Amino acid sequence: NPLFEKRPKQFGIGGALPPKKDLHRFVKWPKVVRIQRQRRILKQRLKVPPALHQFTRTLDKNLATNLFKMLLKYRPEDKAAKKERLLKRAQAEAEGKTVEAKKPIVVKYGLNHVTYLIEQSKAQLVVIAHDVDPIELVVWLPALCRKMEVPYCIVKGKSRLGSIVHKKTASVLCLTTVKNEDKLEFSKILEAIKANFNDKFDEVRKKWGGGVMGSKSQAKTKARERLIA
């Protein structure tokens, strides 16, 4: 006990050698990291036009989770789950000579198929991933949806959409039909979605995004207007 002592180190500007603290800010990153961070910086600096600024305005967290509950209910057929449907009709085709199957109800996907459906008005709801690259694949969707009068939402996460259909990226989904036991709970999210996006289009098409300067620049601005007062 007596031998134990305190030896304070003075971490001055010419004192002890400083220890291992967090230098994550100043790390020199690979060029891949560097350009992708400067990418979001430049997309913030520049003035995003209204067509692209309609994105980053996504469906809420609660509304998105509630909608994804239903999208999880109506998932497509797996591959292992698609072998059995064709393998067990063997008795019906070899012996029965009858087709007894009925229409299943699944979510539709793929940009071309969903655009065909939307232009033929067989789409009850359209789900657009906010983060599609290249964006031109989904820039034109909101206007098409709005002016063909289809409820559309821009949810967050093309990978999370891709999971619904078991592909790596999905970039668009749509519901065309729902089972009779879930119409009310579908039309509630339909009311919310229609109120949120399809009505506010006619005023967000004039709103410019982007132009939010950096933290330091905003700090000097906040310094400047105080002096201006």
Partner: protein, 251 residues
């Protein structure tokens, strides 16, 4: 005609600098946290003669701010530094000869050397033997400063730029006549192959605009335009006047 001696220098074949026994670049320390917001003590270990340069060079051994090792920096000697001297580097280092300070810490009239131009370019002005710059005024609404350079030219420089207090050592070196082709040759051997120089008037026209003629004479105006093509821009480039300077003309 053929390529002129003045054009031939752009390749480096026989005109590169003789840099075998030089002791490395003579420059300040990397500008960092310590040197910006405080002071660092460096001990001067030896003042060495750098071949090819008129000024002595002071090797200074700092301690690395954030990792356990020394730093042998190499400064341009300011007249007065001696081995064992502690030179202080940073903002709040006192103003004494050999110390290096930003111009925000040097009062008007102070004599300085090895000045930076862009904050951190490690010292570029007033480095030749016996040259200094006088810090004239400070504008704190811009964070800028003014200096009188050895040429008499007056420059505006950022105020956060470092500068060594004092003047470069070896002053008055050029005061001594060399008296000999020998001394001239040994001067230029360790600098570069730019000596002896043959008067173009004693050349042939194929290699110099002045050459040729039964007598030795230039032939036309010895002053050429600023825009003259290379190989013709030879003589007195874009001269504003000529003749021995008298009166205000030499001010």
């Amino acid at each position: 005609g053929r390529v002129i001696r003045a054009q031939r220098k752009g390749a480096g074949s026989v005109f590169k600098s003789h840099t075998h026994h030089r002791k490395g670049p003579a420059r300040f320390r990397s500008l960092d946290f310590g040197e910006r917001n405080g002071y660092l003590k460096g001990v001067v270990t030896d003042v060495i003669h750098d071949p090819g340069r008129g000024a002595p060079l002071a090797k200074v051994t700092f301690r690395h701010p954030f990792r356990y090792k020394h730093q042998k920096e190499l400064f341009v000697a300011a007249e007065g530094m001696y081995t064992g001297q502690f030179v202080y580097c940073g903002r709040r280092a006192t103003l004494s000869v050999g110390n290096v300070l930003p111009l925000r810490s040097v009062p008007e009239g102070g004599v300085i050397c090895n000045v930076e131009h862009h904050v951190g370019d490690r010292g570029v002005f007033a480095r030749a033997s016996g040259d200094y710059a006088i810090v004239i005024s400070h504008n704190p609404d811009n964070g800028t400063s003014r200096i009188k350079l050895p040429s008499g030219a007056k420059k505006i420089v950022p105020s956060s730029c470092r500068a060594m207090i004092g003047q470069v050592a070896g002053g008055g070196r050029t005061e001594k006549p060399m008296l000999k082709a020998g001394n001239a040759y040994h001067k230029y051997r360790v600098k570069r192959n730019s000596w002896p120089k043959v008067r173009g008037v004693a050349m042939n026209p194929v290699e110099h605009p002045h050459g040729g003629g039964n007598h030795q004479h230039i032939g036309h105006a010895s002053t050429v335009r600023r825009d003259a093509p290379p190989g013709q821009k030879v003589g007195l480039i874009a001269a504003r006047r000529t003749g021995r300077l008298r009166g205000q003309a030499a001010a």
